Amino acid sequence: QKSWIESTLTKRECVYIIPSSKDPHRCLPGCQICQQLVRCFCGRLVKQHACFTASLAMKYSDVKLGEHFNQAIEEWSVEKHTEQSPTDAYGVINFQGGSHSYRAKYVRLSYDTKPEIILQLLLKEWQMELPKLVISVHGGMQKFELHPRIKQLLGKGLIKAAVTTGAWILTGGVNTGVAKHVGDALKEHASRSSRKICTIGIAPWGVIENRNDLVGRDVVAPYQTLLNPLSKLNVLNNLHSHFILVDDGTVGKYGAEVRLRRELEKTINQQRIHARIGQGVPVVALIFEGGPNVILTVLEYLQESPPVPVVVCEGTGRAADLLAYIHKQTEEGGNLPDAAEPDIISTIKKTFNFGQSEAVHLFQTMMECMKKKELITVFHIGSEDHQDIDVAILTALLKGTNASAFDQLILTLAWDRVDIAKNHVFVYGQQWLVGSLEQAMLDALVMDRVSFVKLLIENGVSMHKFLTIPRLEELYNTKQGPTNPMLFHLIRDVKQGNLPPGYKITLIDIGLVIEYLMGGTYRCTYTRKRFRLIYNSLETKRFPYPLNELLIWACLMKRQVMARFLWQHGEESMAKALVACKIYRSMAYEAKQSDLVDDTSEELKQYSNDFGQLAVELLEQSFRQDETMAMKLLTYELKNWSNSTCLKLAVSSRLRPFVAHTCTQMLLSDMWMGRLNMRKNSWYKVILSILVPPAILMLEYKTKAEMSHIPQSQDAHQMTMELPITRKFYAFYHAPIVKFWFNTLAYLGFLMLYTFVVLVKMEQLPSVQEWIVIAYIFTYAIEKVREVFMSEAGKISQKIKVWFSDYFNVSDTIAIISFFVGFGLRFGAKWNYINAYDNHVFVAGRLIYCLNIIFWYVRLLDFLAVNQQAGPYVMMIGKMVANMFYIVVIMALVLLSFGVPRKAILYPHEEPSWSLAKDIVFHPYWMIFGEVYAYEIDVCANDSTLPTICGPGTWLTPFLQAVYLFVQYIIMVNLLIAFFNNVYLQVKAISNIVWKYQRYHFIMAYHEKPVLPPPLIILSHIVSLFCCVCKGPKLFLTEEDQKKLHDFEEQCVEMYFDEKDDKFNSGSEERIRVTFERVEQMSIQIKEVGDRVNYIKRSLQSLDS
Amino acid sequence: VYLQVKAISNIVWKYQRYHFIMAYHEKPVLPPPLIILSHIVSLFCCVCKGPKLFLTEEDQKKLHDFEEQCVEMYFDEKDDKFNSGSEERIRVTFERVEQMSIQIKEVGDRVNYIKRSLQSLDS
Amino acid sequence: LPITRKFYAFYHAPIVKFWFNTLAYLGFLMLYTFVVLVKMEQLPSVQEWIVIAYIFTYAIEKVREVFMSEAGKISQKIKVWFSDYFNVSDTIAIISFFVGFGLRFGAKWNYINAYDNHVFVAGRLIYCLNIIFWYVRLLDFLAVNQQAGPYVMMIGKMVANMFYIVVI
Ligand SMILES: CCCCCCCC/C=C/CCCCCCCC(=O)O[C@@H](COC(=O)CCCCCCCCCCCCCCC)COP(=O)([O-])OCC[N+](C)(C)C
Ligand SMILES: CCCCCCCC/C=C/CCCCCCCC(=O)O[C@@H](COC(=O)CCCCCCCCCCCCCCC)COP(=O)([O-])OCC[N+](C)(C)C
Ligand SMILES: CCCCCCCC/C=C/CCCCCCCC(=O)O[C@@H](COC(=O)CCCCCCCCCCCCCCC)COP(=O)([O-])OCC[N+](C)(C)C
Ligand SMILES: CCCCCCCC/C=C/CCCCCCCC(=O)O[C@@H](COC(=O)CCCCCCCCCCCCCCC)COP(=O)([O-])OCC[N+](C)(C)C
Ligand SMILES: CCCCCCCC/C=C/CCCCCCCC(=O)O[C@@H](COC(=O)CCCCCCCCCCCCCCC)COP(=O)([O-])OCC[N+](C)(C)C
Ligand SMILES: CCCCCCCC/C=C\CCCCCCCC(=O)O[C@@H](COC(=O)CCCCCCCCCCCCCCC)COP(=O)([O-])OCC[N+](C)(C)C
Ligand SMILES: CCCCCCCC/C=C\CCCCCCCC(=O)O[C@@H](COC(=O)CCCCCCCCCCCCCCC)COP(=O)([O-])OCC[N+](C)(C)C
Ligand SMILES: CCCCCCCC/C=C\CCCCCCCC(=O)O[C@@H](COC(=O)CCCCCCCCCCCCCCC)COP(=O)([O-])OCC[N+](C)(C)C
Ligand SMILES: CCCCCCCC/C=C\CCCCCCCC(=O)O[C@@H](COC(=O)CCCCCCCCCCCCCCC)COP(=O)([O-])OCC[N+](C)(C)C
Ligand SMILES: CCCCCCCC/C=C\CCCCCCCC(=O)O[C@@H](COC(=O)CCCCCCCCCCCCCCC)COP(=O)([O-])OCC[N+](C)(C)C
Ligand SMILES: N#Cc1ccc(COC[C@H]2O[C@@H](n3c(NCc4ccc(Cl)c(Cl)c4)nc4c(N)ncnc43)[C@H](O)[C@@H]2O)cc1
Ligand SMILES: N#Cc1ccc(COC[C@H]2O[C@@H](n3c(NCc4ccc(Cl)c(Cl)c4)nc4c(N)ncnc43)[C@H](O)[C@@H]2O)cc1
Ligand SMILES: C[C@@H]1CC[C@@]2(OC1)O[C@H]1C[C@H]3[C@@H]4CC=C5C[C@@H](OCCC(CO)CO)CC[C@]5(C)[C@H]4CC[C@]3(C)[C@H]1[C@@H]2C
């Protein structure tokens, strides 16, 4: 059948017939009038059945021969005289009119359906999600009216209570009862609002208009709101999203809905509210009017097991006005005050007139309701009852139903409502147990509800006690919440490619992920001996810093709102923000590169850049407070983050705004000096003190106190304890500023020689000038092999892959290799002794030198770039060569568009020759640079320098060249002037940032360099290899300075969050709106007090007469 | 004039990129020395005997649902932006200080008619 | 995905048709540049026949583009095809080439010295100018890139706007 509905759900049709009561309507021909009018006691008359079996009985006179023994007339039994079949009416209502064409779903099932099959319909078949609340609205059965005051408020909270909790509203569906005003509340307060409420309406099929219109299989129904005055039935309301229409077999009568509805309430309250929680989906009953069937229903619920509470609304109709009335005059449980029988029966006799016996009967039904006063809520809309029915509907389930504070909290957790938990579960004087709070935390973390994690920490949860191994090991192994498919992939990589099927994640495996994601020499606390030991054992399992471990969890699970929350709790705030930037950045890179599912890398990089911006904004806060302590914050060993450093973590993530912040640049400037005080010295004296060593003793240095924020070597720090003479020489030659100039003077004296060598004749054997040059380039290359081995990271292929990621290290490799190719050819050649340059091998070697020299001038940009101003312009050149590339590809096309016709028109009689490759490209390029070749244009002219080139067609070339230069200069050169001038500012801004970033790697490279330059560096090597075989900088803090520094960081995260709010709360946009939202409330309170004075005037006339 | 010519020119390039790419679904496989094969094969298969987005029935359904949901979000977010702006909150603030100011002097007039009752019920 | 479906999937991709046409077009200009720079005897060299084959078969491709354009109204198929710069220049570049091949090929060769025939000269010089259309057409292929394309499109918009400074 290709439909679960057709196979399972069943209709009902009165196959048998039973005529109406007795009476022929009028009109003597008794036989005719019988078949014409007479209803079946089914509910439909004889000609509506059609009931093919009964049809061959319709002809006789009907089914069932005549008088039929009046016992057997009433023997109508829906179980006996009515038949099932694969249903006809299930599809989609397409409400025509209204607006937007609101679209609902329906079905025509039998009341013989089992209760579970309806839950199988809503969820599996109609594709609905199981809710966290059900609101069963009973009330008016006949169309009524509400004060537009009382209308809109119930439409504020019945919505808001159903949006947040993903609730189902079970109505009657028919547009005559509560469903009208429930349905209207959907209208005014934007039921869509990007979050539709799954409003269901259960009605019986026998009483609804347009039954035929809803017939068909998966058919879109042209159903309309045509309230014909001649109609007798009800119209399906528009704004209800779903409908269940019981097929009682009869037509016309009500009744065959109340079973299914109550059984659906059971069938939902017998479902787990959420896989993590062990309650059932609660149910609440809401009331807007009522007759006897309603207040009887109210009694049922209070009697039920489990008891379903009730919310009555004073000011809405017959019952609800009464149920608040009788309830207000009542006491603790079960009473009327001594003289109230006369008054209350009169209200019954007036409010719903049955009269003095059915009043007293239903009055006794009202007694047993008021007995269970504890479950019923009487939210009265008059002034301020139960704080805005939202609270009342939701808090009503948190009343005398014996549910302990745990069960009270966990339900507000599933709903994701803290305002309830704050104001109604953490009420003054609550009876909390030992593990209830901790257990609710484990549920909030896994379900990713930060606002309860906040609430529980505030209300007494210590995350040191709640962070054991199995818990935090469980937290990674959860599908009960927002999970990361990226994590299980990262685990497969570190595990050599294997993944056993069950595989509960462990913490030693998370450690291998973080070590992989942070890279280099990072070593997590999960892979150490202390942890691996106690791990196999499981006070001693409590993680002294848990919020360092849940910040990683939140980030490996891609739970940002949890991450930013768990970040601002604890200490080491910048460090946690800079690790987090590196985790996501690596996850983004792996997620991008790894081809597993849809990318998710745009999400992770933004998460990285969010934490990377926090760290910068903190560093600015620290820096504006105390510049000296802020520089210490950059360089202290962390001891919880693998003995790393906040700079080292920012550099690790290529986080340029932190490295280009004016604190790092202020520190890097102070490491550049060393012990020297270059505030009260000058570069004249540093250079002179290099060439005149004894002048090292007459320039000023820094004390141990100015050097307290500056990281140092072990030896450098020991020599601050003592300033003697031999300490002032160590302090000088080991400064990065001194190593620099001491290398520039050697490098400038290098080029002066190597320029001299290349311009002067070169005999068979190298001159003294040339041996000094080979010594430099040789010893300089040993220096570079030393740089690679002592780089940072023990993984060799990374030492190499990072060293060739630098322009001037790649060119040195080319410049050094090329030079010894040149020296080999120069030196190892059979000299001729008649004329050099009869040896093509000596030529090659010399010409390699004459080109190798170019690498060594361009390298002066590495030394010029140490300056503030020069450096950025150096860095621009690369960024600008990259961006002009395509204007220059067009300029090269225009070149060959011209050079090939020019050469072909002027030189026809050419054989194939490699000169053709030159001549199509040579002169047209030199035209770009001012050379017009004025006397080679018009080769047939008298002033021509190419009169032999005159021939047929050569008059075309001046036209071609006129076009050529127009295109080059007047378009393509000025487009390029236009390019640069309109891209200068942002390339100059990036280039200041990139220069300030490379200034880290530059300066920190010079702590590592030896003292002596690259002719004399070999001494420093031989001394180092002699002291390596026979036998970086840290910020040393004493114990009282690590103390005062952590106090400094905490104080600056306070000022940060404070000033961030004070800026926001003091802004224009935020004061306009709080002004706006109070003129809301006041304007209501003036008309309220404007209404009261109207009720003060009435008293004046009252007390007057 | 560089910036606005460069901005138009990104737009015009992105427009011509339609005609360019959609021209290549139509092109044969072989380039214009060997394209003649693809022609002879096409004239041989034309005498002897563009791209559509095929959706099944359940994807035309889920797609029309997607469009309707996005016109909702469009009109909603267009109003929420407007109703939440400064100019619109200043004026609804303005138009209520109109009404309240009238209702204070109104209630400021009533209390003048409450004082008269005090002297009245006094004597 | 079977084997013969992976070949269909490849050669019928627009990215593949492109590069498969650029390599043929780049190898076209390399020949047609060689033909124009080297002496041209009475009969075309192998390099030049391959060039005529391209420009011929390439023109049949363009007649196919016009007929299979979109809209059955013929004068619209034509009016829309000549609304494109590089289709107009191909019409000039293709027509000019066969004027040139006709004069080059159908001339009474002299056998004492070429260029005593003013008709052979004209045909050759048409090739030496027709070559310009076929370089500029590399901007139609360079313009496939993000960055290059817009700068290509600027040149026209900027030649139009500088017109009156250049009249002065
Ligand atoms: C961190 C990375 C960056 C640093 C990179 C460092 C590595 C740089 C790598 C450098 C090596 C590059 C190649 C060297 C030259 C060989 C090739 C050549 O042209 O040979 C010639 C010389 O043949 C000889 O026999 C004479 C060689 C003399 C020694 C000079 C090279 C050794 C120094 C290397 C010091 C390097 C180590 C530096 C310190 C580590 C052969 O030709 P010929 O015999 O002259 O003439 C033959 C024909 N004829 C006889 C007819 C005329
Ligand atoms: C017909 C002639 C045509 C061409 C002619 C010349 C032009 C040829 C130009 C070639 C450069 C190609 C590199 C492109 C730029 C890439 C980006 C970059 O910053 O690169 C590098 C810097 O930039 C340079 O290294 C630029 C070097 C050329 C600038 C001019 C040199 C002046 C000295 C010579 C004077 C000699 C004069 C006399 C000589 C005899 C470094 O960056 P990176 O580490 O690679 O990082 C990539 C950036 N990213 C991370 C943001 C992605
Ligand atoms: C769409 C945009 C429009 C463009 C604008 C219009 C384009 C300009 C149009 C210019 C008109 C053309 C001028 C040539 C006229 C014929 C020459 C001739 O018959 O004899 C000459 C041949 O000389 C040549 O054949 C050289 C051809 C002229 C080159 C002009 C280049 C453009 C430079 C300017 C471009 C900027 C223009 C500025 C505009 C104000 C010489 O005479 P002869 O008797 O053969 O020989 C005598 C012997 N003798 C040589 C030994 C002495
Ligand atoms: C979608 C739109 C874009 C595409 C457009 C496509 C259409 C392009 C249109 C192209 C046609 C252009 C004109 C062709 C040449 C004729 C003019 C000429 O110079 O004749 C000469 C050659 O006269 C001959 O008799 C030899 C001709 C040889 C055949 C070459 C042309 C035919 C190929 C065409 C293939 C085109 C079709 C391509 C495929 C469809 C006459 O001079 P001569 O005899 O050499 O010398 C006389 C004097 N003398 C003897 C004293 C020296
Ligand atoms: C003395 C010399 C004077 C002049 C000299 C040269 C300059 C002569 C320039 C003439 C161009 C005239 C066109 C004006 C622009 C119109 C707008 C436009 O976009 O047009 C077209 C693109 O743009 C082009 O086609 C521009 C072509 C010239 C640019 C340079 C060519 C470089 C290659 C040659 C190198 C060869 C070098 C060697 C050769 C031997 C296309 O647009 P459209 O489809 O028409 O749509 C109209 C736009 N609208 C819809 C917005 C209205
Ligand atoms: C690697 C780094 C080393 C460190 C650098 C310091 C140590 C290096 C210092 C010196 C080493 C050189 C020894 C000098 C030998 C004297 C003979 C001589 O050269 O006579 C020449 C005169 O010219 C000179 O005397 C000057 C030669 C050097 C010029 C460059 C020096 C500047 C750099 C250093 C100082 C400034 C430092 C600037 C920066 C602050 C005559 O020419 P010839 O070639 O002898 O004659 C044969 C000619 N023939 C071949 C054509 C037949
Ligand atoms: C990776 C580095 C290694 C590079 C490869 C190894 C390079 C070493 C290669 C060769 C070493 C052996 C040299 C002799 C070659 C045989 C020919 C011969 O002997 O004599 C001939 C030389 O003919 C030449 O071509 C000489 C120049 C060739 C050197 C090319 C170096 C470029 C390498 C790239 C640059 C490095 C850049 C590297 C940057 C990364 C003739 O000279 P003759 O003997 O005097 O006889 C006179 C002839 N006569 C009778 C006609 C008058
Ligand atoms: C269109 C704009 C207005 C112009 C309209 C008017 C012009 C119309 C167009 C072209 C005019 C062509 C004739 C002029 C030459 C006469 C003199 C002559 O003989 O010159 C030379 C030959 O010249 C030729 O043989 C010409 C080649 C054919 C023209 C090719 C198209 C060029 C223009 C592109 C197409 C046009 C569209 C371009 C769009 C801008 C000299 O050769 P010779 O005689 O052998 O000399 C003896 C040599 N000896 C002593 C060394 C042995
Ligand atoms: C239309 C598209 C086709 C597709 C392209 C591929 C197929 C086309 C491939 C080949 C077809 C050509 C056959 C070669 C014949 C050999 C003889 C020869 O030419 O000898 C010459 C040497 O020069 C050469 O051998 C090279 C000649 C071609 C240069 C351009 C090839 C690059 C393009 C294609 C390849 C790279 C592709 C790049 C793109 C990725 C000697 O000169 P000559 O003229 O023989 O001697 C007479 C001289 N005379 C007249 C002065 C008296
Ligand atoms: C739409 C396309 C069709 C174009 C029109 C049809 C073109 C075909 C036209 C003509 C075909 C017939 C050629 C012969 C002409 C008569 C003269 C003659 O025979 O000999 C003379 C040639 O004199 C010349 O002028 C030769 C060059 C003319 C060709 C012009 C082509 C430009 C067309 C525009 C370019 C196309 C651009 C199209 C782009 C849209 C002399 O040469 P000879 O015979 O060797 O005698 C030696 C003389 N002597 C004794 C002095 C030494
Ligand atoms: N204090 C200080 C200080 C001293 C020197 C420097 C120079 O920095 C050198 C490094 O600067 C790097 N670099 C450079 N180098 C600039 C440059 C290098 C070579 C040449 Cl020929 C030129 Cl025309 C310009 N440009 C970069 C870029 N656009 N993006 C990222 N990195 C770039 C490059 O790896 C090179 O090794 C920077 C700061
Ligand atoms: N992917 C991709 C892609 C590939 C190629 C292209 C190139 O587009 C070609 C078309 O671009 C058209 N075109 C162009 N072409 C640019 C151009 C054409 C020729 C030359 Cl010589 C130059 Cl100096 C520049 N400019 C236009 C403009 N200013 N306004 C409207 N249309 C313009 C023109 O009709 C031409 O046919 C565009 C996108
Ligand atoms: C898309 C672009 C179009 C333009 C262009 O790039 C690509 O197309 C390329 C094709 C090249 C030619 C191919 C083959 C040869 C043969 C050789 O024959 C040696 C003979 C003898 C020496 O005497 C041996 O001993 C001489 C050189 C020549 C003609 C090339 C010249 C440059 C050309 C024209 C290039 C040009 C820059």
Curated annotation (Swiss-Prot), chain A:
Organism: Mus musculus
Section of the entire sequence shown: 3 to 1230 of 1863
Effect of substituting residue 981 to Q: Abrogates the inhibitory action of physiological intracellular Mg(2+) concentration. Does not abrogates the inhibitory action of Mg-ATP and PIP2
Ranges facing Extracellular side: 761-766, 828-840, 908-909, 951-953
Encoding gene (name): Trpm7
Subunit organization: Homodimer. Homotetramer. Forms heteromers with TRPM6; heteromeric channels are functionally different from the homomeric channels. Interacts with PLCB1.
Effect of residue 982 to Q: High constitutive activity. Abrogates the inhibitory action of intracellular Mg(2+). Abrogates the inhibitory action of Mg-ATP and PIP2
Protein name: Transient receptor potential cation channel subfamily M member 7
Entry's localization field: Cell membrane; Cytoplasmic vesicle membrane
Phenotype of null mutants: Inactivation of Trpm7 in mice results in early embryonic death (6.5-7.5 days). Mice die as a result of trophoblast defects and consequent failure of implantation. Tissue-specific null mutants shown defects in cardiac and renal morphogenesis, organismal Zn(2+), Mg(2+), and Ca(2+) homeostasis and thrombopoiesis.
